[PDB]
């Protein structure tokens, strides 16, 4: 059954990566990940920064992304898409966020234990069914900005929020990268011995 | 080993019942799932509205709290507190959240369903080891509003943030007596029956 699941899952994989839709910093962890036996990826992001478009705040139905930076992102940038906004523009930071479907309650317990490890509080499983494993971070810098194409607040707030924004997102990639290197770290560890 | 784990854990869960250090909205429900033979809780958070001055954000080392509401609160109230900032006036909503430890993976399983099924998205197991299941939601309305006792941003724009943070607030409370309600239906099966 694992083997058969995992080869579904990966092949979802290599069609997002043949439609180029999997974020590109993040491609190298994704394999790393299903390089192992015991996992296989479900999907991804690796955390970004946008300004969106919404009539009510958590109204997805109303929303239509204004800008989206996969990183650090000028407060130039920022305003340029706000000052397009129809409704009402928020600034909104997403952390980068993995799930990852595991064999065994082991490979699920190892995978944690590394996503703590990098920084990542708050991963957990998140079905039980094939130990899919959430790793994440607090999801919410989300503040209003712009209102039909007029500012709600000042230069050097807006600045302030973006700075802020940016240091977070920073941080999410950080983390990401630690990820990779301790399982690469784990991976590796007989790569220059047979025995 | 359980029931000697149950013990130990419901000895600090009647503890800070006596020393009034449980959120008096939620004695009912950690009560109740207490009042299950395979969960004990663990700790909980009913959810609040804060107003906290910190140095930068995230700086957990510079911050106190200005003020901090378990239920709906006045724009006014959170003005009063932001005009008492030393440093920089935050508005943090923070989402309800409960630990649980489940006796095995069955009992893991039908905790994060009721949890799931009350709206509670982003539930799941944090520890495999005592299977202590998370049961939360995304936790940031975080921002500014003002500085050394002096307000960022406008009375509309406070209002407007305010609103959403009790709208939030509320949407927590609910689901929260759902997930009470499940338990409970589930608990009360055979209420009126001895076969």
Request: net charge neutral; charged share 30%; aromatic share 8%.
């Amino acid at each position: 059954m694992w083997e058969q699941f995992k080869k579904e899952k990966l092949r979802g994989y290599l069609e997002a990566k043949n439609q180029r839709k999997v974020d590109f910093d993040i491609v190298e962890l994704l394999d790393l990940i299903n390089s192992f036996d015991d996992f296989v990826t479900l999907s991804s992001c690796s955390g970004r920064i946008a300004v969106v478009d919404l009539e009510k705040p958590g109204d997805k139905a109303s929303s239509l992304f204004l800008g989206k930076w996969h990183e650090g992102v000028e407060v130039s940038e920022v305003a340029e898409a706000a000052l397009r906004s129809r409704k009402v523009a928020w600034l909104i930071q997403y952390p980068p966020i993995i799930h990852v479907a595991c064999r065994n309650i082991g490979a699920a317990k190892l995978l944690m234990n590394a996503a703590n490890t990098a920084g990542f509080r708050r991963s957990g499983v998140i079905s039980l069914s094939n130990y899919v494993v959430e790793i994440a971070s607090l999801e919410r810098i989300e503040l209003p900005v712009a209102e039909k194409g007029l500012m709600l607040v000042d230069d050097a707030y807006l600045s302030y929020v973006v700075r802020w924004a940016n240091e977070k997102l920073l941080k999410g990639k950080e983390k990401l990268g630690r990820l990779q290197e301790a399982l690469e770290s784990l991976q590796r560890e007989n790569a220059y011995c047979s025995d």
